[PDB]
Amino acid sequence: GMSNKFLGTWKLVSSENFDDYMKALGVGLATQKLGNLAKPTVIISKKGDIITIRTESTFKNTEISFKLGQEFEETTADNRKTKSIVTLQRGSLNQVQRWDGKETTIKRKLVNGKMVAECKMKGVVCTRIYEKV
Ligand SMILES: CCCCCCCCCCCCCCCC(=O)O
């Protein structure tokens, strides 16, 4: 099961290739500029076997509740109606969003008490590091 070291509140402290990740999904040019400046706070809670990942920003807010391996509907920060699944692999929390015959993965790993986020999309690789607060 998901390591409870994921639980807590994480604050973004480093972003790489996110600008290109955003652009690579079709994110509106207005929603783009505001995402390159956002430093969201991420809160991972649990309530039995349901995992909730909240994304709190000044700009926007998002939130997803799910069970591992079970497909759910997600509406993304940039308004994408996706059909996502979250799986566990070697301790990494891999989320995959599918829509319009497209697909992207968000692997959330832990590295030295800090959470790393690998976002893939058509050869684009974003990397965001998160510090527990
Ligand atoms: C997460 C900032 C929201 C504002 C920017 C909107 C366009 C981004 C769309 C996809 C969400 C980004 C996923 C990376 C977040 C993470 O690593 O926790």
Are 4 and 124 in contact, with CB atoms under 8 Å apart? Answer: no
Residue 84 CB coordination number (10 Å): 20
Are 63 and 48 in contact, with CB atoms under 8 Å apart? Answer: no
- Backbone region of residue 100 per phi and psi (left: phi > 0; alpha: psi in -120 to 50; beta: other values): left
- Residue located nearest, by CA, to atom 1 of ligand 1: 40
Query: Which residues are CB-neighbours of 86 under 8 A, at least 6 positions away?
Result: 51, 66, 68, 69, 93, 94, 95
> CA quadruple 11, 47, 103, 26: dihedral positive or negative?
negative
Cβ–ligand 1 distance for 124 under 6 Å, the answer no
- Residue located nearest, by CA, to atom 11 of ligand 1: 77
Q: Among candidates 52, 45, 37, 35, which has minimal Cα distance to 7?
A: 45
Residue 12 CB coordination number (10 Å): 19
| Structural domain boundaries, residue 43 | 1-133
Check whether 129 is labelled as a binding-site residue: yes
Method for structure elucidation: X-ray
CATH number of the domain to which 81 belongs: 2.40.128.20
Resolution in A: 3.0
Tell how far the Cα of 44 is from the centroid of ligand 1, in angstroms: 15
Residue 93 CB coordination number (10 Å): 22
Query: How many domains does one find in the chain?
Result: 1
